[PDB]
């Protein structure tokens, strides 16, 4: 498959700050796919963060980010977004976007996703 994902928007911020991650997809339209965000730490290789259905009407979130993060998408631009509010030191991680092409709703397990990007580093200073 010739699908390529490029995450951006990572950075170094203070506790309480906000970031807006984005991911641009090339090689295929995303308009029939669910899309997910995961994050990598020493303790979790791909911790689930968020997932959004093909039209953007539904979303699910990892327990530790509920109420703070918002996932969105723009199918015509082939882009997915993760708004991160109220950042905490334990949100420090490399953040990845990935494709769910199972056409079976929203899921939270990394092995069900494809076409991982190389991620974007988020560092939240204590």
Author numbering: 2 to 127
Task: List sentences from the manuscript.
Nucleocytoplasmic transport proceeds through NE-embedded nuclear pore complexes. With a molecular mass of around 120 MDa and an outer diameter of ~120 nm in higher eukaryotes, NPCs are among the cells’ largest protein complexes. Nanobodies (Nbs) are the isolated variable domains of heavy chain-only IgGs. Using a selection strategy against conserved epitopes, we obtained anti-Nup93, Nup98, and Nup155 nanobodies that block Nup–Nup interfaces and arrest NPC assembly.
We describe an anti-Nup93 inhibitory nanobody that prevents the incorporation of Nup358 and the Nup214·88·62 complex, indicating a specific arrest in the assembly of the cytoplasmic ring. To map the functional epitope of xhNup93-Nb4i, we solved its structure in complex with the α-solenoid domain of xNup93 (residues 168–820) and xNup93-Nb2t by X-ray crystallography and cryo-EM. In contrast, xhNup93-Nb4i recognizes an epitope in the middle of the Nup93 α-solenoid (i.e., residues 450–536). This nanobody cannot interfere with the direct Nup93-Nup188 and Nup93-Nup205 interactions, since it efficiently purifies the two complexes from HeLa and Xenopus egg extracts. However, the alignment of our structure with recent cryo-EM maps of the NPC revealed that xhNup93-Nb4i clashes with a Nup205 molecule from a neighboring Nup93·Nup205 heterodimer, which would plausibly explain a failed assembly of the cytoplasmic ring. The epitope of xhNup93-Nb4i is poorly accessible in properly assembled NPCs, but becomes accessible in NPCs upon Nup358-depletion. The inhibitory anti-Nup93 nanobody imposed a late block that impairs assembly of the cytoplasmic double-ring, as well as the cytoplasmic appendices. The resulting NPCs lack Nup358, the Nup214·88·62 complex as well as ~1/3 of their Nup98-APD-binding sites.
